[PDB]
Design a protein around this motif. Structure first.
Motif, PDB file in Angstrom:
ATOM      1  N   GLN A 121       9.591 -39.399 -39.290  1.00  0.00           N
ATOM      2  CA  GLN A 121       8.645 -39.997 -40.153  1.00  0.00           C
ATOM      3  C   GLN A 121       8.920 -41.162 -40.980  1.00  0.00           C
ATOM      4  N   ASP A 122       9.988 -40.893 -42.016  1.00  0.00           N
ATOM      5  CA  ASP A 122      10.494 -41.851 -42.809  1.00  0.00           C
ATOM      6  C   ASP A 122      10.420 -43.215 -42.270  1.00  0.00           C
ATOM      7  N   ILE A 123      11.361 -42.955 -41.112  1.00  0.00           N
ATOM      8  CA  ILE A 123      11.684 -44.457 -40.440  1.00  0.00           C
ATOM      9  C   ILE A 123      10.617 -45.159 -39.953  1.00  0.00           C
ATOM     10  N   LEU A 124       9.657 -44.452 -39.155  1.00  0.00           N
ATOM     11  CA  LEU A 124       8.541 -44.986 -38.695  1.00  0.00           C
ATOM     12  C   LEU A 124       7.539 -45.698 -39.770  1.00  0.00           C
ATOM     13  N   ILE A 125       7.482 -44.683 -40.944  1.00  0.00           N
ATOM     14  CA  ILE A 125       6.630 -45.170 -42.136  1.00  0.00           C
ATOM     15  C   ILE A 125       7.381 -46.624 -42.579  1.00  0.00           C
ATOM     16  N   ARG A 126       8.623 -46.523 -42.974  1.00  0.00           N
ATOM     17  CA  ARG A 126       9.180 -47.644 -43.579  1.00  0.00           C
ATOM     18  C   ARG A 126       9.033 -48.776 -42.521  1.00  0.00           C
ATOM     19  N   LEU A 127       9.046 -48.566 -41.203  1.00  0.00           N
ATOM     20  CA  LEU A 127       9.023 -49.742 -40.198  1.00  0.00           C
ATOM     21  C   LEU A 127       7.700 -50.258 -40.570  1.00  0.00           C
ATOM     22  N   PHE A 128       6.603 -49.354 -40.579  1.00  0.00           N
ATOM     23  CA  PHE A 128       5.132 -49.862 -40.421  1.00  0.00           C
ATOM     24  C   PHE A 128       4.688 -50.592 -41.826  1.00  0.00           C
ATOM     25  N   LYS A 129       5.367 -50.057 -42.821  1.00  0.00           N
ATOM     26  CA  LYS A 129       5.098 -50.906 -44.233  1.00  0.00           C
ATOM     27  C   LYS A 129       5.800 -51.870 -44.298  1.00  0.00           C
ATOM     28  N   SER A 130       7.054 -51.915 -43.775  1.00  0.00           N
ATOM     29  CA  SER A 130       7.917 -53.345 -43.972  1.00  0.00           C
ATOM     30  C   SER A 130       7.290 -54.462 -43.189  1.00  0.00           C
ATOM     31  N   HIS A 131       6.853 -54.113 -41.915  1.00  0.00           N
ATOM     32  CA  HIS A 131       6.646 -54.582 -41.012  1.00  0.00           C
ATOM     33  C   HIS A 131       5.294 -54.494 -40.299  1.00  0.00           C
ATOM     34  N   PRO A 132       3.939 -54.698 -40.786  1.00  0.00           N
ATOM     35  CA  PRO A 132       2.852 -54.517 -40.411  1.00  0.00           C
ATOM     36  C   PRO A 132       2.345 -54.737 -38.964  1.00  0.00           C
ATOM     37  N   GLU A 133       2.898 -55.756 -38.374  1.00  0.00           N
ATOM     38  CA  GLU A 133       2.509 -55.966 -37.002  1.00  0.00           C
ATOM     39  C   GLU A 133       3.254 -54.919 -36.099  1.00  0.00           C
ATOM     40  N   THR A 134       4.142 -54.029 -36.345  1.00  0.00           N
ATOM     41  CA  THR A 134       4.644 -52.993 -35.562  1.00  0.00           C
ATOM     42  C   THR A 134       3.773 -51.973 -35.251  1.00  0.00           C
ATOM     43  N   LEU A 135       3.015 -51.590 -36.341  1.00  0.00           N
ATOM     44  CA  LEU A 135       2.056 -50.462 -36.177  1.00  0.00           C
ATOM     45  C   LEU A 135       0.791 -50.887 -35.260  1.00  0.00           C
ATOM     46  N   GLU A 136       0.516 -52.191 -35.097  1.00  0.00           N
ATOM     47  CA  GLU A 136      -0.465 -52.927 -34.120  1.00  0.00           C
ATOM     48  C   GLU A 136      -0.151 -52.444 -32.788  1.00  0.00           C
ATOM     49  N   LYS A 137       0.937 -52.254 -32.471  1.00  0.00           N
ATOM     50  CA  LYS A 137       1.512 -51.767 -31.239  1.00  0.00           C
ATOM     51  C   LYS A 137       1.246 -50.449 -30.603  1.00  0.00           C
ATOM     52  N   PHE A 138       0.773 -49.711 -31.620  1.00  0.00           N
ATOM     53  CA  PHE A 138       0.846 -48.224 -31.491  1.00  0.00           C
ATOM     54  C   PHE A 138      -0.779 -47.848 -31.461  1.00  0.00           C
ATOM     55  N   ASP A 139      -1.422 -47.843 -30.229  1.00  0.00           N
ATOM     56  CA  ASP A 139      -2.631 -47.685 -30.221  1.00  0.00           C
ATOM     57  C   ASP A 139      -3.155 -46.086 -30.696  1.00  0.00           C
ATOM     58  N   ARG A 140      -1.877 -45.287 -30.699  1.00  0.00           N
ATOM     59  CA  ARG A 140      -1.983 -43.979 -31.111  1.00  0.00           C
ATOM     60  C   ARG A 140      -1.876 -44.054 -32.800  1.00  0.00           C
ATOM     61  N   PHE A 141      -1.609 -44.732 -33.372  1.00  0.00           N
ATOM     62  CA  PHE A 141      -1.326 -44.816 -34.956  1.00  0.00           C
ATOM     63  C   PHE A 141      -1.941 -45.896 -35.652  1.00  0.00           C
ATOM     64  N   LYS A 142      -2.533 -46.909 -34.994  1.00  0.00           N
ATOM     65  CA  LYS A 142      -3.175 -48.009 -35.843  1.00  0.00           C
ATOM     66  C   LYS A 142      -4.230 -47.458 -36.691  1.00  0.00           C
ATOM     67  N   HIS A 143      -4.972 -46.449 -36.631  1.00  0.00           N
ATOM     68  CA  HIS A 143      -6.054 -45.901 -37.268  1.00  0.00           C
ATOM     69  C   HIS A 143      -5.323 -45.540 -38.792  1.00  0.00           C
ATOM     70  N   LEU A 144      -4.004 -45.438 -38.961  1.00  0.00           N
ATOM     71  CA  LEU A 144      -3.375 -45.128 -40.293  1.00  0.00           C
ATOM     72  C   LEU A 144      -3.433 -46.589 -41.196  1.00  0.00           C
ATOM     73  N   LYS A 145      -3.950 -46.226 -42.444  1.00  0.00           N
ATOM     74  CA  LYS A 145      -4.073 -47.531 -43.200  1.00  0.00           C
ATOM     75  C   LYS A 145      -3.163 -47.239 -44.343  1.00  0.00           C
ATOM     76  N   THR A 146      -3.133 -46.383 -44.850  1.00  0.00           N
ATOM     77  CA  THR A 146      -2.072 -45.944 -46.074  1.00  0.00           C
ATOM     78  C   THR A 146      -0.903 -45.396 -45.755  1.00  0.00           C
ATOM     79  N   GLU A 147       0.231 -45.368 -46.534  1.00  0.00           N
ATOM     80  CA  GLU A 147       1.132 -44.505 -46.585  1.00  0.00           C
ATOM     81  C   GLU A 147       0.861 -42.817 -46.858  1.00  0.00           C
ATOM     82  N   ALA A 148       0.028 -42.913 -47.600  1.00  0.00           N
ATOM     83  CA  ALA A 148      -0.467 -41.177 -47.664  1.00  0.00           C
ATOM     84  C   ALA A 148      -1.111 -40.748 -46.215  1.00  0.00           C
ATOM     85  N   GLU A 149      -1.870 -41.458 -45.745  1.00  0.00           N
ATOM     86  CA  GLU A 149      -2.323 -41.350 -44.270  1.00  0.00           C
ATOM     87  C   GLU A 149      -1.297 -40.928 -43.273  1.00  0.00           C
TER      88      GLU A 149
END
Ligand code: HEM
Ligand SMILES: O=N[O-]
Length: 151
Positions: free
Chosen positions: A26-54
């Motif tokens: 979880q910490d690794i994926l969160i660090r990825l997504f917040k350091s590099h927001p383009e990466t989250l866009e590759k996950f249709d499964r996760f791209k609804h997540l907006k905030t670190e809390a979510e």
């Protein structure tokens, strides 16, 4: 080529991850997504997540974190003898998920970051060196499969 001593360091570090695979993943994926927001866009499964809390509240994210690190742990325990394990991940990542090799670089940096954060004063300089080497080998071997396929 990693030495035996270097592979030992890598797996001694990996033993810290195994004590809490879902937390690390979880910490690794969160660090990825917040350091590099383009990466989250590759996950249709996760791209609804907006905030670190979510993201932190997402049990499904933690589930995928376990999936990812289970695969990487198995690879690392092969000590470079990982063609079998690496082939399906190259295929899916290159051709289905469409993940640039650059984004494997970004996840590798996220791994290093998370290990320092979770294990302050307990992730040695030697161990960092060795884990970098291990992650570089993974990326090198994946990248060869990407190039094979034109990606
Ligand atoms: C250490 C690096 C990585 C490992 C070991 C890994 C491993 C896996 C595994 C085992 C799966 C499920 C099986 C599969 O589809 O092949 C998966 C799925 C996926 N991976 Fe990765 N991955 C890595 C990095 C990345 C990166 C950096 C991204 C994007 C920036 C990515 C995007 C995905 C996506 C989109 C899926 C599909 C998730 C779903 O919809 O269920 N992966 N990964
Ligand atoms: O996640 N890069 O430090």
């Amino acid at each position: 080529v990693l030495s035996e001593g270097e592979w030992q360091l890598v797996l001694h570090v990996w033993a810290k991850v195994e004590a809490d695979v879902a937390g690390h993943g979880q910490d690794i994926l969160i660090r990825l997504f917040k350091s590099h927001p383009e990466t989250l866009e590759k996950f249709d499964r996760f791209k609804h997540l907006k905030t670190e809390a979510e993201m932190k509240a997402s049990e499904d994210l933690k589930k995928h974190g376990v999936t990812v690190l289970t695969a990487l742990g198995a690879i690392l325990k092969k000590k470079g003898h990982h063609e079998a394990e690496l082939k399906p991940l190259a295929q899916s990542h290159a051709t289905k998920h469409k993940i640039p090799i650059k984004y494997l670089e970004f996840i590798s940096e996220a791994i290093i970051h998370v290990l320092h954060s979770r294990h302050p004063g307990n992730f040695g300089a030697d161990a960092q060196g060795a884990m970098n080497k291990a992650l570089e080998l993974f990326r090198k071997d994946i990248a060869a499969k990407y190039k094979e396929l034109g990606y």
